[PDB]
Amino acid sequence: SGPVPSRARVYTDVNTHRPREYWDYESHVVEWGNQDDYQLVRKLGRGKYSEVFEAINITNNEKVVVKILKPVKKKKIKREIKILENLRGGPNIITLADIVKDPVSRTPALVFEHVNNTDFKQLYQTLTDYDIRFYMYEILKALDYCHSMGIMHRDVKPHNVMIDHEHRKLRLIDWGLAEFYHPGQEYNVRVASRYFKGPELLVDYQMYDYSLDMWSLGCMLASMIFRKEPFFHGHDNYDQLVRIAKVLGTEDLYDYIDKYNIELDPRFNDILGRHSRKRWERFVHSENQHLVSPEALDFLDKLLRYDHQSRLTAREAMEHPYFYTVVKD
Numbered sequence: 001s002g003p004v005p006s007r008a009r010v011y012t013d014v015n016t017h018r019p020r021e022y023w024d025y026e027s028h029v030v031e032w033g034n035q036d037d038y039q040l041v042r043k044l045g046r047g048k049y050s051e052v053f054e055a056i057n058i059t060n061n062e063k064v065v066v067k068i069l070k071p072v073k074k075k076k077i078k079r080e081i082k083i084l085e086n087l088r089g090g091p092n093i094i095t096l097a098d099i100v101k102d103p104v105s106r107t108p109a110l111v112f113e114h115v116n117n118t119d120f121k122q123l124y125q126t127l128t129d130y131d132i133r134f135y136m137y138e139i140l141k142a143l144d145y146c147h148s149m150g151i152m153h154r155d156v157k158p159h160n161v162m163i164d165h166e167h168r169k170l171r172l173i174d175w176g177l178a179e180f181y182h183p184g185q186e187y188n189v190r191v192a193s194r195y196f197k198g199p200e201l202l203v204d205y206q207m208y209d210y211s212l213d214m215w216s217l218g219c220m221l222a223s224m225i226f227r228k229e230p231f232f233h234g235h236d237n238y239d240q241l242v243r244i245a246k247v248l249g250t251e252d253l254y255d256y257i258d259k260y261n262i263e264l265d266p267r268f269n270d271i272l273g274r275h276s277r278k279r280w281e282r283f284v285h286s287e288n289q290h291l292v293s294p295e296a297l298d299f300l301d302k303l304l305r306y307d308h309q310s311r312l313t314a315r316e317a318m319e320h321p322y323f324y325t326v327v328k329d
């Protein structure tokens, strides 16, 4: 027993090599601004510990997104601030415009750049073979950047990908679950949306790294090119691994758990059983043939792997023939 240790293949000691101020977010001092400088316009939605609004900066009339941080620990507030500030000026990463507190309730809020988003449910239906490779390369620039900066996003999903299609502009948002990578640290597996959770989260292997975001991206890719959102549609965390297993096959799931000496949660051992690998070509039909190519299926196969150490890194993902000629490099 005892899980086998794992280290990130890239950007391993990146935080160990920067001063405390960089990654020791609890000790970071926040200079809170005023929310009274912002006029809220309409409610955009909510998170686990957040309420989101589209607002206006009174002084310059610019549209802005205001995320009120509902009862959370100030530890997590400071972590999101620190990640956003470290990643500012990064490609396809949302810009943190201000850090504020309400004058009356004193509740903290983060102010972001506004993106004129089209809901993925109406947008993906409209995307071309080129569009998908373009947007996928843009998500990867954002992921290679934050991974190179020592941060795991940990919640890569269509709702966290703001796309202004008309302007062909993409922003990776909600760095509210993002964490700093530290070699040999065991992270909380109760992160990400059910559908995009990596098998490491599902099997409860805590010593995961940057490669988690790579699995979620592969999930986003599958829903697009096959026109099936979400691609892996479990009704719970146990049924999620069952859906994955029915596609990737159990041979590799068991080789994975055996390799890292993962003690599966016992409820798994009653529902997992044995499944043969389903080839990606099985998901290819008449309606999505225009989005599919041998290189799309190869790229996808290299991301959707159980073994986190076997998935492509964001740099390798960008070097793939899937993106040849899509961008300059």
Ligand SMILES: CC(=O)Nc1cc(Nc2cc(Nc3cn(C)cn3)n3ncc(C#N)c3n2)ccc1C
Pocket (backbone or CB within 6 Å): 044, 045, 046, 047, 050, 052, 054, 065, 066, 067, 094, 112, 113, 114, 115, 116, 117, 118, 162, 173, 174, 175, 176
């Ligand atoms: C804020 C955050 O961390 N997560 C989040 C985000 C939203 N929603 C939007 C919508 C738009 N843009 C938008 C969409 N629409 C129809 C109009 N304008 N933008 N833009 C930039 C950003 C950012 N950051 C953002 N967020 C809802 C809920 C949550 C939890």
Ligand SMILES: [Cl-]
Pocket (backbone or CB within 6 Å): 188
């Ligand atoms: Cl956490």
